[PDB]
């Protein structure tokens, strides 16, 4: 899947200044682009606009060369796998949440394999009816990290053309979490991936790194080229 922002400006409802200004961003099919910058710089806004929680003020977002606003909502949800705290949950079983409410389109074994590959099966097993426990209402509320791993499992299961990855819980070390990064690394390979970077070390391998400051893209390049550029990214290379 191809994703392109053309002269995109966006302002959160009620705000008086834009969150994004004249964003031009091309992510060709199969490439990974890492967005870096301070929290509140607009990097998360860029990724989240693809989900159409809001519409842009001006400009164009194109998906496979078609404006986002031309897709039916069903087609939009099918194209994009969101791995973030805003992954959409259903008042339904865990298995049905991993399957994105698509029933009898996946097998039980596929759902279970996706759960294990996301390292979600450990906490799922502690629920009374396992994968078939009803989450949400009159049921279990997911912790934040549990919700992320449900999102990883859903993304692993669906094999979607577009991945939006918010690398939350940058504090990572142990075994089940080290292999989470390994699972994410394989998922973003062979897929158009927009990654919200929260630790710089995790995105040195992106095909292009994009530095956002105050809603403006200030620098673009590979990790090595950006270091030789001795600009903003090179200065941010002080957190290591």
């Amino acid at each position, epitope marked *: 899947g191809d994703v392109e922002f053309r002269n995109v400006t966006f302002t959160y409802p009620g705000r008086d200044v834009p969150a994004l200004r004249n964003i031009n961003l091309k992510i060709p099919a199969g490439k990974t682009v890492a967005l870096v910058g301070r929290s509140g710089s607009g990097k998360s806004t860029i990724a989240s606009l693809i989900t159409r929680f809001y519409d842009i003020d001006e400009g164009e977002i194109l998906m496979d060369g078609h404006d986002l606003r031309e897709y039916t909502l069903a087609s939009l949800r099918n194209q994009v796998a969101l791995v973030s705290q805003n992954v959409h949950l259903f008042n339904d079983t865990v298995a049905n949440n991993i399957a994105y409410a698509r029933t009898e389109q996946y097998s039980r074994e596929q759902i279970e394999e996706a759960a294990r590959m996301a390292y979600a099966m450990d906490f799922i097993n502690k629920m009374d009816n396992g994968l078939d426990t009803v989450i949400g209402e009159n049921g279990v509320l997911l912790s934040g990290g549990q919700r992320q791993r449900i999102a990883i499992a859903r993304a692993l299961l669906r094999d979607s053309p577009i991945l939006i990855l918010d690398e939350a819980t940058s504090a990572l070390d142990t075994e089940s979490e080290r292999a989470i990064q390994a699972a994410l690394d394989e998922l973003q390979k062979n897929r158009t991936s927009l990654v919200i970077a929260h630790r710089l070390s995790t995105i040195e391998k992106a095909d292009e790194i994009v530095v956002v400051e105050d809603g403006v*893209i200030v*620098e*673009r*390049g590979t990790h090595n*080229d*950006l270091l030789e*550029h001795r*600009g903003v990214y090179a200065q941010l290379h002080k957190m290591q």
Partner: nanobody
Amino acid sequence: QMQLVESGGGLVQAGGSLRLSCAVSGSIFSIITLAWYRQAPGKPRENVATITRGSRTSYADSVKGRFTISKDNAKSTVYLQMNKLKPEDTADYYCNAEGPAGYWGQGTPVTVS
């Protein structure tokens, strides 16, 4: 569409000085990173000097103490003051905006005899 237009290049003898200019239209000039790169006939295109939002500057080691990058928000122009020019500075000099995968001028030639 963004345009970067260099000027000021030419022929100078060793020890001479040259000031390059680059007019930038279509950019959020005060915020994006600006830079000068250069490329000699056999070598790849390499960074010379870089200036970020607050006019914070950086330089390649071979150029420190001789070259100076600066920017003018009012004129939306970026400049490269080249003093104490060495023959090894002979190259095509390129203006750049938004980093090495960003936008590029078409260069201005510099020859140091």
